[PDB]
Amino acid sequence: ASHPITGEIQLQINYDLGNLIIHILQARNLVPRDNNGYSDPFVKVYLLPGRGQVMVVQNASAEYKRRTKYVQKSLNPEWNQTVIYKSISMEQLMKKTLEVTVWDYDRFSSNDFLGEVLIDLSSTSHLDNTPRWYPLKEQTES
Numbered sequence: 001a002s003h004p005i006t007g008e009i010q011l012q013i014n015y016d017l018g019n020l021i022i023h024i025l026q027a028r029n030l031v032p033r034d035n036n037g038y039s040d041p042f043v044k045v046y047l048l049p050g051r052g053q054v055m056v057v058q059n060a061s062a063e064y065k066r067r068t069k070y071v072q073k074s075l076n077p078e079w080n081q082t083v084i085y086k087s088i089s090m091e092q093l094m095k096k097t098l099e100v101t102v103w104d105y106d107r108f109s110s111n112d113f114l115g116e117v118l119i120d121l122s123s124t125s126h127l128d129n130t131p132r133w134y135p136l137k138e139q140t141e142s
Contacts, residue, residue: 003031005115005138007076009043009100013119014129019086020047020093020121024057025131026078027102030114036074039105040065041114043079047088047096047121057081077102094122102136113139 007029014021024043043057059065060080065073072078088096098121102114115136119126126132 003033003112005113005136006031007115008133008135009102009115009117010131010133011100011126012129012131013098013124013126015088015090015093015121015124015127017086018089019084020088020096020098021082021084022098023083023129024079024081024100026072026076026080027115027136028076028133030075030077030102030136032075033104036071037069038074040069040073041077041102041104042111044101044103045083046099047085048099048118049092049096050085053085055083057083096121098124100134100136101139 007027009027010025012023022045040059044054046054057079058081098119100117103111104114105111116139117134117136
């Protein structure tokens with residue numbers, strides 16, 4: 001079988017004190033799979049022109065997720081997390097692009113792809129902390 005990459009991702013961007021902050025929220029219209037609810041999808045966000053630092057997103061209060069993971073975790077998973085990249089000025093920042101990538105855990109440990117977005121910080125109008133949706137594309141390997 002195969003799973004096509006679809007859906008989008010919602011996040012909040014904000015840069016302050018020379019530090020780039022990014023908050024993860026959730027994704028919608030993701031790739032459906034057999035047996036609803038089984039694995040908690042995670043995201044990876046790193047700058048293109050950086051040191052290759054991939055920051056994975058954590059899961060919010062499972063207490064509230066455990067009740068929503070039913071259909072959400074299956075089609076639209078959330079995270080509601082926050083990350084920062086200190087030591088980054090608008091000079092190099094504008095040159096860097098925030099790439100949000102969704103990944104699902106395997107049955108043993110591996111991680112499958114789910115979606116990839118590219119947010120150019122050169123014009124990131126969502127800097128003023130604004131929850132906006134971003135289209136998740138596929139990871140082409142030419």
